[PDB]
Amino acid sequence: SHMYLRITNIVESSFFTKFIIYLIVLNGITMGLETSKTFMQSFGVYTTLFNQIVITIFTIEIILRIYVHRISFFKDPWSLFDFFVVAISLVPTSEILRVLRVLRLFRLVTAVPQMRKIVSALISVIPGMLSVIALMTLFFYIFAIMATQLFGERFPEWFGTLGESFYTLFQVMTLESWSMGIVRPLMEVYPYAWVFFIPFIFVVTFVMINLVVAIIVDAMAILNQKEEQHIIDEVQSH
Amino acid sequence: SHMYLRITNIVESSFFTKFIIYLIVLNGITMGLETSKTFMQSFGVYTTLFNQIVITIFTIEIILRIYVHRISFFKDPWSLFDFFVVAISLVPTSEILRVLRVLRLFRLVTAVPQMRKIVSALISVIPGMLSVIALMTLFFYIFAIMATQLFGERFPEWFGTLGESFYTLFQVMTLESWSMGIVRPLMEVYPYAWVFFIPFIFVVTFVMINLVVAIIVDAMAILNQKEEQHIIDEVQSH
Amino acid sequence: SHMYLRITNIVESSFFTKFIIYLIVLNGITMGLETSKTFMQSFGVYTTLFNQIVITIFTIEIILRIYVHRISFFKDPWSLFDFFVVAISLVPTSEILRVLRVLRLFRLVTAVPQMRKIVSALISVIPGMLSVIALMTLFFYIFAIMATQLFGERFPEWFGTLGESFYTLFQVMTLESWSMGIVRPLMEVYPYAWVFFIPFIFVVTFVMINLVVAIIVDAMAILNQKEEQHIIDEVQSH
Amino acid sequence: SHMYLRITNIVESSFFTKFIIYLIVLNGITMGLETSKTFMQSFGVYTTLFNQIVITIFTIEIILRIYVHRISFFKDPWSLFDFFVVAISLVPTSEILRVLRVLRLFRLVTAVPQMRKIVSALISVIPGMLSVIALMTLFFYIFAIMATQLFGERFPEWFGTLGESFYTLFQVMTLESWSMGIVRPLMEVYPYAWVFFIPFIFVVTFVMINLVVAIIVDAMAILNQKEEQHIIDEVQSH
Numbered sequence A, B, C, D: 001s002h003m004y005l006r007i008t009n010i011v012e013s014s015f016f017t018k019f020i021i022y023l024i025v026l027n028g029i030t031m032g033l034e035t036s037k038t039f040m041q042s043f044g045v046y047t048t049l050f051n052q053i054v055i056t057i058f059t060i061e062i063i064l065r066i067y068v069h070r071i072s073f074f075k076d077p078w079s080l081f082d083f084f085v086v087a088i089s090l091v092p093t094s095e096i097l098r099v100l101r102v103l104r105l106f107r108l109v110t111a112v113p114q115m116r117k118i119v120s121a122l123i124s125v126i127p128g129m130l131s132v133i134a135l136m137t138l139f140f141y142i143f144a145i146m147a148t149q150l151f152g153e154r155f156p157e158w159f160g161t162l163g164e165s166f167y168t169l170f171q172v173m174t175l176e177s178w179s180m181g182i183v184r185p186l187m188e189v190y191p192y193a194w195v196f197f198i199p200f201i202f203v204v205t206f207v208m209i210n211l212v213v214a215i216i217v218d219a220m221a222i223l224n225q226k227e228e229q230h231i232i233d234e235v236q237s238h
């Protein structure tokens, strides 16, 4: 425990975390700079060693943080993310992984409380949304099957395959070129194609909007219930 | 009644409904798989018999459910949907019906309470919206007539027919290519076309947004009224 | 007054207004039908006389309604609209007016209370919005001037004229083809064009959204204030 | 102080500010008119002197306003804006500055209280949004780096440079031609490009919407807290 607490006070120190954030911001600049072939032709040699240094320093940090937090480390999503992001960056350059190394810049999120809270807040709405996401995903699935069968023979790029139809249906949901780009061309062969995509557009837009309405209104319903118990307590007491 | 209750306990059992959901999920996978010509060339023979089996099993189920629920069955929208969806799947392969058979996968909605409640909730906002939908539909109708008369001679694909103008006006409402794709081309012949579509875009966007504003605010007004009676009861009593 | 009240009871009768609505719906169908050249080649002779009849009947109605309501008629927006819409339909076929005759179908709005209330509600948010509309219109005006000066020489169709720039800026505000269709082409000559349109897009989207936020939140603030006085009255009294 | 108060009563007078607003509106019309080459060929000589006069009058005004307000002037954002906008207009015609002179029309905002309040209100939501903007900007930055590395070699116009990728990613965020215009072309070379842009679209849309949800709900939570203390005070007192 003597050796344990020595490490704990370092890993727990504000200098330690401020150092890591320093590295993250420095390496973030570096990774932008490595985007210029000009910059790489000259200073590229330096930035590569720096990225190797940062990676090793983050590996030492992850190791220390694990000795200090023990099993608690692997039950913490933030440090799980720090773990896998640093682990990715450790795969030898031997290819999409070289690109996924950029994800280590998200450590600026996992290391800054203001950023964690923002992400925690945004993520908190999702659990209640799961069943609606499942409903909408079943909806997409059923319509991707139908679209593949209706249109995939004449329009294989857009509908020749379940995956392609899934892609196009998502495009239609964002409303991107849905008419000039997909449905008008379809209607030159299938004049009733609009009977398929208009109702599809209605459901998916209607569901999106009503999802937002329900979150705002149900949130404020709770706010009211919480205020209601507070006022009713006082009137009963005083 | 002896024979009645025997069936009722089966049709009402959790195994019965869990079985049907099992079938729905299995058949849902099957229908995705039947999308691959590769898969069909090999295993296609099996999946066709399976779809025939599921269809017969669902027909037995609908029949049983009707003997158990009697007239209540046909006054229940969920089982009405199960009815017609299974009824569609019964039309002999002799063509758009073959595609509409996929709709039977929506039985996963009508059989899962979490999904029913979601759909019930989303549908509940619609009754209050009917008169606004009618207003907006009258609006579309009047503008489709005018557009057909103004533009249908020179731009028949987009406006040559009430139905075509209805289609294009919906496209303009989603804002999809409304300018580069429709109104700029129109303005090369009708320089004042923008006097028609800009105001059209204003009304339809303004109405959409204010529909959402009114639902949120009127919902919370009720929440307040309900909270108001509760607090006022206490102050009067205690 | 003897002759006055005789007319008043007719013009005020439910049959009278139900008749007019009947005519409006009949003529609305007629105007859709007159959209088919096929239909016009055959039954066109009949529908033209019918439109002449409806127009005369509405003119008699407007006349009666004016004798009954006196100056109150011309201070009523609904009957002002009925007036001008019927007045338009009276201009001899000698051309855009022939099209504006379709607007008489909006009388189905001004004659049906459910529709009036809907329109009244939607319109009620506008007065409070006037100064923001003016702000945003000044904003459009300043940017249309700048855009004309920056881009109108090389891109006259999109920016050669204040009016054209106004049009394109509205297009950019709806986000329709703003990049692939306008700003990327502009940037082939003016690489810094994005410094103009991105901030423009930020302001206009930010203002729209915050307009909606402010209506919902200020509405509910009032709802709270109104609930607050009610509860505070009770606690003081009981 | 004798000379000071003489100026103060003029600079503070309602005539003074009404005069300046008059000039702003007159010059605003002028600047629209100077947009027509026709108008400039004829009356152009007059409007140029008028713009020189207005500019000098505004410079006298800024000078007076500074003698009256002293250091308070340069701590006031509204008069800081009036300052720099008039200062821009003072740079000799020797080029983008000639265009930025139009910004002086925004003085109609800084001189009209109704407009100031509107702008103040809209701006007030921003401070609380800063950390989310930073989060989203870090997000854009990380994805612009990855996109440059994944796609910049084959698609240099859209992704060849951090700045270009930043631009395209903003375009994808507005949903403008994201599929037909960017991702489908990308997928002809990188079939898994959708694994990059779909999740990107999900995050950025999800964050936008939840930003709006959080402002409305947190605003009303405060409204409730404020109402809660008021009602609880009464029940305790009466």
Ligand SMILES: CCCCCCCCCCCCCC(=O)OC[C@H](COP(=O)(O)OCC[N+](C)(C)C)OC(=O)CCCCCCCCCCCCC
Pocket: A150, A189, A190, A191, A192, A193, A194, A195, A196, A199, B096, B100, B103, B106
């Ligand atoms: C609960 C979820 C409900 C889901 C609602 C959406 C249902 C989808 C409706 C399908 C609409 C059909 C769109 C369409 O045009 O598909 C193509 C088919 C076949 O094309 P077709 O017109 O026969 O000519 C093609 C000939 N060819 C290939 C040699 C050129 O075109 C046709 O076969 C024309 C017939 C269109 C029938 C549309 C009526 C379907 C109503 C939906 C059934 C109720 C479901 C609850």
Ligand SMILES: CCCCCCCCCCCCCC(=O)OC[C@H](COP(=O)(O)OCC[N+](C)(C)C)OC(=O)CCCCCCCCCCCCC
Pocket: C150, C189, C190, C191, C192, C193, C194, C195, C196, C199, D096, D100, D103, D106
């Ligand atoms: C309170 C409201 C604030 C409003 C904010 C918006 C202000 C608008 C900024 C203008 C951005 C300039 C966009 C642009 O590229 O316009 C074109 C000019 C001139 O083109 P240029 O690059 O000189 O080459 C053209 C040569 N040619 C014609 C023979 C091919 O391009 C250039 O001259 C390049 C220089 C761009 C300067 C951008 C910096 C302006 C910052 C805004 C000033 C602060 C205002 C408060």
